[PDB]
Design a protein around this ligand. Structure first.
Ligand SMILES: OC[C@H]1O[C@@H](O[C@H]2[C@H](O)[C@@H](O)[C@H](O[C@H]3[C@H](O)[C@@H](O)[C@H](O[C@H]4[C@H](O)[C@@H](O)[C@H](O[C@H]5[C@H](O)[C@@H](O)[C@H](O[C@H]6[C@H](O)[C@@H](O)[C@H](O)O[C@@H]6CO)O[C@@H]5CO)O[C@@H]4CO)O[C@@H]3CO)O[C@@H]2CO)[C@H](O)[C@@H](O)[C@@H]1O
Length: 207
């Protein structure tokens, strides 16, 4: 987002570093992270729209930036569940709950997307996650026989389709601002991949 704004409340949690719902592991233990309420997570009617986004969060004591790694199931609109190293920067740990303002911001990252091909993926069914993206990824499409096919983003932060075809995949990704970039991902196997793997991408959303 270039500009954005939300109000709500934050609490804190030790979860989300490992086994978070968005399958973004490994998460370095000293990263500042957050779980996010389902209503804001599924922005624009896209499941996990905000997975792997970064938020700037302002509390009573200051501002800080967090990586969104997990779902906050019991969260109301605007609600966030921060890691302790983030919460203590913007509020007092003696509080179980604080008022916050927050917004989607550009990821503090460098380089291009990487893609994660989920175990079980094949030409018949594949789940493809985008990582290292500067803004939330709202949409992913691949080209098959001259037409662009929309992939459904899943709760587990991968985009899914079926009968994708043989050969390398031409893909296009759309961010929360409507910016579109295109890339190529190496071919999917004929049989389901026994293990998940990552592939370096060659494109990034614009600044
Ligand atoms: O030779 C005879 C004829 O064959 C035809 O071709 C057939 C072919 O024979 C057949 O093998 C093939 O079967 C494939 C299916 O088409 C395809 O749908 C299927 O996809 C499965 C996949 O195997 C499986 O791994 C995957 O599991 C996902 C799951 O969906 C997902 O929900 C779950 O996510 C969870 C996370 O793992 C978890 O961490 C998180 O917390 O929760 C998540 C959500 O709950 O993840 C798992 C694992 O990744 O599901 C998909 C989809 O259901 O794969 C089959 C085997 O490859 O079909 C072909 C076409 O029908 C020819 O057409 C004909 O000519 C021949 O004569």
């Amino acid at each position: 987002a270039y500009d954005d704004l939300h109000e709500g409340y934050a609490t804190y949690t030790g979860s989300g570093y490992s086994g978070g719902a968005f399958l973004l592991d490994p998460i370095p233990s000293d990263m500042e992270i957050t779980a996010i309420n389902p209503a804001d997570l599924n922005y624009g009617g896209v499941k996990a729209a905000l997975a792997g986004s970064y938020l700037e969060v302002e509390g009573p004591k200051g501002k800080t930036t967090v990586y969104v790694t997990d779902l906050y199931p019991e969260g109301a609109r605007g609600a966030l569940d921060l890691s302790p190293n983030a919460f203590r920067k913007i509020g007092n740990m003696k509080d179980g709950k604080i008022n916050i303002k927050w917004r989607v911001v550009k990821a503090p990252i460098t380089g291009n997307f990487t893609y994660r091909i989920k175990e079980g993926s094949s030409r018949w069914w594949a789940a493809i996650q985008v990582r290292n993206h500067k803004y939330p990824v709202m949409k992913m499409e691949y080209e098959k026989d001259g037409k662009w096919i929309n992939m459904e983003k899943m709760d587990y932060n991968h985009f899914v389709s079926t009968n994708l075809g043989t050969g390398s995949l031409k893909v296009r990704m759309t961010d929360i601002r409507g910016k579109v970039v295109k890339d190529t991902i190496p071919k999917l196997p004929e049989s389901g991949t026994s293990k998940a793997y990552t592939v370096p991408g060659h494109v990034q959303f614009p600044e």
